[PDB]
Design a protein around this ligand. Structure first.
Ligand code: CLA
Ligand code: CLA
Ligand code: CLA
Ligand code: CLA
Ligand code: CLA
Ligand code: CLA
Ligand code: CLA
Ligand code: CLA
Ligand SMILES: CC(/C=C/C=C(C)/C=C/[C@@]12O[C@]1(C)C[C@@H](O)CC2(C)C)=C\C=C\C=C(C)\C=C\C=C(C)\C=C\[C@@]12O[C@]1(C)C[C@@H](O)CC2(C)C
Ligand SMILES: CC(/C=C/C=C(C)/C=C/[C@@]12O[C@]1(C)C[C@@H](O)CC2(C)C)=C\C=C\C=C(C)\C=C\C=C(C)\C=C\[C@@]12O[C@]1(C)C[C@@H](O)CC2(C)C
Lengths: 227, 213, 230
């Protein structure tokens, strides 16, 4: 909680540094309810980890194959050769079921903390739980914990906040200039005064709709302007 | 203390946090008298249950007409029903009023006399018609699953859910009426027109709702 | 304590685990009333048993006679006993047995006695589990077998519902649709036949006709809840 988010601000009396990355920000007072603070920490960890994976994926996907737009990589006709033009219904089914399982397990760990630790088939195997949101065990196989856990949680959540900001940046850049992260960076370095957020905000390069094997996904932008 | 319709405003004394869906909304003080408040409670529940049935039926038949099944819109189904089936509308209306009059007079005279309707006069049915609470008859006929019986907190949660979905369905039926009067088409036609272009297709772009432009 | 449907949840106060198949599942609290719970227990048992017999029947009918669709098997038998003679026999026999079962449901100590040969009767049993002449060669403990019965029966209830909804969407029987799924796992799901988005809705059309003749009439043959289909 020390070294807060601003020089002259005070921390709310529910943010006292017991959570990692606590700068005492909470300007909307959403974490004033401890129940809601627990749930929002879990959602923060989820958004953070998914966004770290997301920026890693967009970056490594542009580096490995710059041939493919990450904004259009979800389209089935841009999928790799073992999966090109695959039926998105069965794909969505795989994803839906396999994610329903794990996310309901995580949610039951939130509701009753320490109740879904054991494997339900091979009932000899229990994931530990130092904290809610940090299962460990098979999720910490290299064992980087049982050391500086608070410092590693701080690193995780800081890089995760940064990755959330960075992925929304990726998305908005892809919507504005129609380019990936590194493509946008190189386009800035090519002409860093005629190619910036000016002369590119106000134009959305996302189409009004996209036909995906019969469906028409509505395909909006995060702000209005130019199709 | 308790959620109010107008945060900050204290609730009126006659709206204690006891009835289902009590948010202290009585600006005209219509239910200030207790017996009048019981009457209006049963009126709200009957209105909301009829409106839940009506919204569900309108929604289902609109779904059927929208996906292509053999369904008219809610504003055309009476004519279609009495003309597809050679049904005499007077006969249907008087049968409906006979049956609903029996039912609603039983309602009325259980409200006037709660101890009534359970003497065995109807067909020997005594306890099926005694009524649990005002507006919540219960029993083996009106509550065949026994959901009022057993768990009481579940029963209160269900009362809240009932009154709230009933108010939402009353608003929804008012919306169906206004949307037919404005757009001249079905409810889910309105919804599809809104989901097509959420902007430029709403009540501000009919020329009926806002006559300024 | 006991295995639950949600390994972290708390079962309702009215589900103490005494009953077979009691896994704490009553999110709506339908079995909260002690009197409604007996009726729902019996209805679960008879639904389970009817659905198990019916699923086994469709499967074995599909294996023995793949020539006939189980959804159409009502109008394709052409027995010499006509439709209405069979319907009358079934009506009266099922009326007898179901009224007997119902009389055991209401007043349990009522009907264990044979109404013809007084020497034969059922031993004092539990409602839903007659026993006696209904149960020769019970193989093992009765409690675990009641649990097995109700579990296979819930599975068979879902299996008959699946037969219905995969015979209305696919028009094929259970094993035929299973082979249809094995021959195209990613394209023959219901997710790959149907999808609704905010702006369009693609539903699978029924392979069942809306009406069938059956001897001079027209039986309405509707899809279950089409329109609500995804
Ligand atoms: C900057 C990123 C970052 C950091 C510092 C951490 C740090 C941590 N995580 Mg988190 N995590 C991350 C990203 C990160 N994670 C992402 C993207 C996911 C989703 C796949 C997860 C999913 C996750 C789970 C499910 C669990 C952890 C756990 C842990 C702890 C031990 C592992 C560790 O130190 O790895 C450090 C990682 C690196 C040094 C490599 C990063 C670069 C790669 C190429 C520690 C607090 C475990 C824990 O706390 O249990 C006790 C645990 O259960 N994390
Ligand atoms: C309060 C700030 C504000 C507001 C409300 C708007 C509002 C708008 N801008 Mg402007 N804009 C702003 C600041 C603002 N802009 C700044 C600081 C820059 C730099 C731009 C550069 C900019 C461009 C380049 C374009 C817009 C456009 C637009 C319109 C669609 C987006 C909308 C009316 C678009 C338009 O329709 O014109 C467009 O092409 N804006
Ligand atoms: C006819 C339907 C009807 C009836 C009889 C009631 C009755 C009641 N409501 Mg409910 N209510 C309704 C519809 C109804 N409500 C709807 C649709 C909503 C959502 C907008 C609500 C939301 C609501 C809240 C949030 C609360 C109540 C409460 C109450 C109680 C106290 C107020 C009172 O005495 O009202 C008497 C009402 C009438 C005599 C009927 C009103 C008819 C007027 C005279 C005509 C004007 C209505 C309207 C403005 C016009 C729109 C349609 C028009 C364009 C044609 C009482 C039991 C309070 C409570 O404690 O309940 C337990 C409370 O907190 N109601
Ligand atoms: C959201 C809707 C809703 C809810 C929560 C309730 C809740 C309740 N009602 Mg009310 N009721 C409703 C709608 C609702 N009702 C409607 C529409 C009617 C008119 C038919 C009634 C008529 C009615 C009477 C006459 C009585 C009750 C009673 C009760 C209580 C016990 C039953 C129960 O637990 O219901 C739980 C409700 C649900 C779990 C909702 C089920 C969801 C349905 C099946 C969705 C599908 C609807 C379908 C499309 C259309 C159905 C058609 C219909 C003709 C069957 C409880 C407070 C009894 C009572 O108070 O006992 C003391 C009582 O006597 N209600
Ligand atoms: C149950 C809620 C509900 C829902 C989900 C919808 C949804 C929709 N309506 Mg409908 N509508 C409703 C209620 C509802 N309406 C009611 C109650 C009315 C009468 C005023 C209307 C009248 C209406 C018209 C005339 C039109 C729509 C249209 C539409 C569509 C676009 C939205 C729009 O134009 O703004 C309409 C949104 C509202 C009117 C607000 C929603 C209802 C509010 C929240 C009720 C508040 C009541 C309040 C709590 C108590 C009142 C008493 C108080 C004054 C003291 C959309 C599908 C348009 C359409 O067809 O799209 C193509 C259109 O032209 N609606
Ligand atoms: C009609 C068939 C039926 C009936 C009467 C029952 C009755 C019962 N079940 Mg069983 N059950 C069934 C089918 C049925 N079950 C199926 C198919 C499954 C597998 C999903 C289960 C799984 C199950 C578990 C795991 C447990 C029970 C338990 C119970 C008891 C408490 C719940 C209660 O009172 O609700 C009474 C239920 C009804 C009145 C039926 C509800 C009908 C509503 C109105 C419509 C439901 C529509 C449905 C959602 C559509 C599903 C189809 C498809 C989409 C899958 C009670 C004896 C608990 C128990 O044993 O405690 C003693 C328990 O732990 N049930
Ligand atoms: C749930 C019960 C059920 C129902 C309603 C049906 C209905 C049908 N079956 Mg299926 N079947 C079932 C279970 C069921 N089956 C089971 C469990 C099996 C596995 C043994 C089969 C195996 C089977 C085959 C192999 C064939 C059918 C066929 C048929 C059709 C004609 C039957 C006929 O001619 O009667 C003949 C009637 C009798 C032989 C008399 C009944 C036998 C004795 C008296 C025992 C009955 C009492 C006993 C205690 C069991 C009752 C308990 C329980 C079922 C409730 C008809 C659609 C035929 C078909 O495809 O038609 C096109 C066909 O070839 N069935
Ligand atoms: C005789 C007969 C016939 C030919 C139909 C015909 C129809 N019904 Mg059924 N229905 C009937 C009696 C009949 N109804 C009765 C007596 C009840 C009670 C129902 C309850 C009912 C429901 C609940 C639904 C239908 C629906 C439908 C339509 C689509 C088919 C379907 O179920 O999906 C179709 C026009 C569906 C409609 O689609 C939205 C639907 O959801 N019906
Ligand atoms: C989860 C996430 C991103 C996940 C991304 C994923 C999975 C990306 C996947 C893909 O890209 C790849 C990999 C490859 C592509 O081919 C395919 C897809 C699928 C497209 C972003 C979250 C992004 C989340 C963001 C940006 C959240 C920002 C939240 C903020 C700023 C909150 C602020 C406050 O709430 C506090 C903290 C305190 C309050 O009191 C005050 C305020 C100010 C309200
Ligand atoms: C909106 C409504 C009532 C609104 C009341 C309000 C706002 C009251 C407000 C207040 O009083 C309070 C609360 C407190 C006071 O101090 C202040 C005010 C402000 C005065 C009732 C709707 C009530 C609406 C009802 C009962 C609707 C029933 C609909 C049915 C039966 C539909 C049937 C059909 O549509 C189908 C199903 C198929 C078709 O083919 C055939 C038909 C028949 C057309």
């Amino acid at each position: 909680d020390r070294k807060l988010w601003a020089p002259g601000v005070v921390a709310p009396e529910y943010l006292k540094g017991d959570l990692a990355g606590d700068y005492g920000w909470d300007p909307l007072g959403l974490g004033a309810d401890p129940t809601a603070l627990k749930w929002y920490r879990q959602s923060e960890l989820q958004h953070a980890r998914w966004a770290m994976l997301g920026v890693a994926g967009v970056l490594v996907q542009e580096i490995v194959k710059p041939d493919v737009y990450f904004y259009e990589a979800g389209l089935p006709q841009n999928l790799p050769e073992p999966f090109t033009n695959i039926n998105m219904g069965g794909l969505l089914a795989w994803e839906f079921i396999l994610m329903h399982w794990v996310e309901v397990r995580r949610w039951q760990d939130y509701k009753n903390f320490g109740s879904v630790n054991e494997d339900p088939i091979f009932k000899g195997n229990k994931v530990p739980n130092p904290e809610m949101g940090y299962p460990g065990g098979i999720f910490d196989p290299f064992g980087f914990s049982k050391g500086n856990l608070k410092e590693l949680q701080t690193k995780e959540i800081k890089n995760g906040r940064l990755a959330m900001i960075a992925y929304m940046a990726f998305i908005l850049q892809a919507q504005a200039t129609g380019k990936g992260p590194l493509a946008a960076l190189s386009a800035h370095l090519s002409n860093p005064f005629g190619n910036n957020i000016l002369k590119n905000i106000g134009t959305c390069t996302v189409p009004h709709s996209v036909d995906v094997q019969g469906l028409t996904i509505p395909l909006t932008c995060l702000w209005p302007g130019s199709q | 203390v308790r959620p109010v319709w107008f945060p900050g405003n204290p609730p009126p004394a006659h709206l204690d946090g006891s009835l289902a869906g009590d948010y202290g909304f009585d600006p005209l003080f219509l239910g200030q008298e207790p017996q009048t408040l019981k009457w209006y409670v049963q009126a709200e529940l009957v209105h909301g249950r009829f409106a839940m049935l009506g919204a569900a039926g309108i929604i289902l038949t609109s779904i059927g007409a929208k996906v292509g099944l053999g369904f008219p819109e809610w504003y055309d189904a009476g004519k279609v029903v009495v003309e597809k089936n050679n049904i005499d509308f007077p006969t249907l209306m008087v049968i409906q009023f006979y049956l609903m009059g029996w039912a609603e007079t039983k309602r009325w005279y259980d409200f006037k006399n709660p101890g009534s309707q359970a003497d065995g006069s109807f067909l020997g049915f005594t306890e099926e018609f005694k009524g649990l609470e005002n507006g919540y008859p219960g029993g083996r006929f009106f509550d065949p699953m026994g959901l009022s019986r057993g768990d009481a907190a579940k029963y209160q949660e269900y009362k809240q859910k009932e009154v709230k979905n009933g108010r939402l369905a009353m608003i929804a039926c008012l919306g169906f009426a206004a949307q037919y009067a404005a757009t001249g088409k079905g409810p889910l036609d309105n919804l599809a027109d809104h989901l097509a272009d959420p902007n430029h297709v709403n009540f501000a772009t009919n020329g009926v709702s806002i006559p300024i432009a | 304590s006991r295995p639950l449907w949600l390994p972290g949840s708390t079962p309702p106060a009215h589900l103490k685990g005494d009953l077979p198949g009691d896994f704490g599942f009553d999110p709506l609290g339908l079995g909260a009333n002690a009197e409604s719970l007996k009726w729902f227990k019996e209805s679960e048992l008879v639904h389970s048993r009817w659905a198990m017999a019916a699923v086994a029947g469709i499967l074995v009918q599909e294996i023995v006679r793949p020539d006939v669709f189980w959804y159409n098997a009502g109008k394709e038998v052409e027995s010499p006993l006509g439709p209405l003679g069979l319907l009358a026999v079934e009506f009266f026999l099922m009326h007898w047995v179901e009224v007997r079962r119902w009389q055991d449901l209401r007043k349990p100590g009522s009907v264990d006695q044979d109404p013809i040969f007084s020497q034969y009767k059922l031993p004092p049993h539990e409602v839903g589990y007659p026993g006696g002449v209904f149960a020769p060669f019970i193989p093992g403990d009765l409690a675990e077998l009641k649990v097995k019965e109700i579990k296979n029966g819930r599975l068979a209830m879902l299996a008959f519902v699946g037969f219905v909804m995969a015979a209305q969407v696919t028009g094929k029987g259970p094993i035929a649709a299973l082979q249809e799924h094995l021959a195209d796992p990613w394209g023959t799901t219901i997710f790959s036949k149907a999808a609704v988005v905010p702006g369009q809705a693609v539903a699978p059309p029924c392979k069942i006709p809306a009406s069938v003749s059956y001897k001079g009439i027209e039986i309405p043959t509707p899809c279950f809840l089409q329109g609500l289909w995804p």
